[PDB]
Design a protein around this ligand. Structure first.
Ligand SMILES: [Mg+2]
Length: 102
RNA sequence: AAGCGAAACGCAGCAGACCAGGC
DNA sequence: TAGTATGAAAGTACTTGAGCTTGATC
DNA sequence: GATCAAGCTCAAGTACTTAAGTCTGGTCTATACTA
C-alpha cells in the first residue's frame, strides 16, 4: 500500500497508490487520478456518467469502467496495472493532500 | 391676473533580432 | 504516441622578458 | 680588481572598453528525443 509515480505517458510525475501487488513481479495495480478530457490535462475525479454520456470507447460495469485504450477505473479513480520498472517505489513521500486524495 | 363638469445592473503585455526609411 | 527533452579599430593601462647599477662577495 | 644576483628600466605583448540624437514602418522567431 505504498505510493509510486509513473515514468511515461501523460501520468508522468503523478502520485499513484499501490492497490494490489502481483506476485509475478511484472505489473502492479495502481490507483491514479485520471488526467483526461473524457474524449471531449489537469488531475480531476473520474466521471463515469460523463464518459458514458460522451460515449466513444467506453464499457460500463457499474462502478467499474473501461475506456480509451483499456484504461480501467474501479469506483471514481483509475485502477490499472503498470510495469514494475515504469514506476518508482522509493523516495515518493506523498503529502497530506495526496493522502486525502487517496 | 387667472379659473370649470355651473429591483437590480470602461483590461491586459511577449520580447528580442534584422531590414528599409525619416530630419 | 504522446510526451518530455536535446579583408577596411584604436586607444590606454598592465604584465612580461631583456639589459644594466650597486651591492655582497672574493 | 673581478664576479653574480637583485632589481630597476625599457620595448614587446595582452585585456578591455568605446564608437550622434530621436522617430516610423516592415518581417521573423526550434525540434530532437525515444520513450
Ligand atoms: Mg529638416
Amino acid at each position: 500500500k505504498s505510493w509510486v509515480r509513473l515514468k511515461r505517458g501523460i501520468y508522468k510525475d503523478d502520485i499513484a497508490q499501490v492497490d494490489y501487488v502481483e506476485p509475478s513481479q511484472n505489473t502492479i495495480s495502481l490507483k491514479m487520478i485520471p488526467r483526461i478530457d473524457y474524449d471531449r490535462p489537469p488531475q480531476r475525479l473520474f466521471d463515469a456518467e460523463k464518459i458514458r454520456s460522451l460515449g466513444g470507447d467506453v464499457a460500463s460495469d457499474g462502478d467499474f469502467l473501461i475506456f480509451e485504450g483499456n484504461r480501467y477505473s474501479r469506483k471514481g479513480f483509475l485502477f490499472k496495472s503498470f510495469a514494475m520498472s515504469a514506476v518508482i517505489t522509493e523516495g515518493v513521500k506523498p503529502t497530506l493532500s495526496e493522502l486525502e486524495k487517496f
